[PDB]
Amino acid sequence: AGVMTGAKFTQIQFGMTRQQVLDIAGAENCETGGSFGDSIHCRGHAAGDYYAYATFGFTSAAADAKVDSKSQEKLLAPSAPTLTLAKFNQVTVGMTRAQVLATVGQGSCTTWSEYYPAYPSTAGVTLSLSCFDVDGYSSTGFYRGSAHLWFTDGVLQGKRQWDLV
């Protein structure tokens, strides 16, 4: 029932088939083809330009293919955002995911994108986090203070911010 939600996103697991994903998300919410290729894109509540949404990628277009990629915008909210420019600057290329979260706060970041290129293997796993200052997150409009953090194999590779002080 209903649109795509953070709860349904959380319930979907790497390794699930397309049938299982569509059963959980609600097939009326979702589309494939065009620019998405074989990925499945599912819409949540309206949100300015567009909608919150999730995009799921699969090992192949086959019926038994497995979820190897999960991405979302505006479905999960950061729980306690405290990011500052100071914290952003003390994060460094080469830190582990655990040292980064300790630096920026457990509750400042949500998972933007998570992809296993050799699923079920964890080699080459790429993770992107989107992290916010105190009013930087919007579930409806433009963001107001955020960073993106890119990890490969568990280690920070890159960082970028917009509007942090």
Ligand SMILES: [N+]
């Ligand atoms: N892609």
